[PDB]
Amino acid sequence: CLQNGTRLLRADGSEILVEDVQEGDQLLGPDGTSRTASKIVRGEERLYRIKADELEDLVCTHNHILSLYKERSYERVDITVDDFVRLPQQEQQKYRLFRSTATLLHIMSIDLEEKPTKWSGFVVDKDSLYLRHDYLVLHN
């Protein structure tokens, strides 16, 4: 469940707003093969902004699942936004967002927004992973 305005990659490569994703739309997965979106949902609530370096922030709901990498090379970890929020900061520093091109990105901040915001979400088939416009790997 992402903030409205987030741009995802379609199966061809072109962009699409997350609020415009409809039932059966073809998104792009991290392995290059296609993805089918279903069970579109909308809402409005105070979201979490994840500030990473270089890349545009990731604004999502508290129950959103992050696909991250953890140190000690790296191991693949899926963790919800709430649990990651409650993690100690020295533990949070061991996690990395990642994109498909094998680039790692440090999570530098994560905070609750001041005002509510419209958000859209869906579910994805296969490995249930899809790609943001900047090729950031996102989960259901």
Residue numbers in the entry: 1 to 72, 90 to 118, 132 to 170
Q: Which statements did the authors publish about this structure?
A:
Structural and sequence analyses indicate that the Prp8 intein is most commonly located at an area on the surface of the Prp8 host protein responsible for binding of U2 snRNA, U6 snRNA, and intron RNA. This suggests that an unspliced Prp8 intein likely would interfere with the binding of these RNA elements to the spliceosome, and thus, disrupt spliceosome function. Therefore, inteins are attractive potential drug targets.
The fungal intein of interest here interrupts the gene encoding pre-mRNA processing factor 8 (Prp8), which is the largest, most conserved, and highly essential protein of the spliceosome responsible for mRNA splicing. The Prp8 intein belongs to the class 1 intein family. The Prp8 intein is one of the most widespread eukaryotic inteins, present in important pathogenic fungi, including Cryptococcus and Aspergillus species.
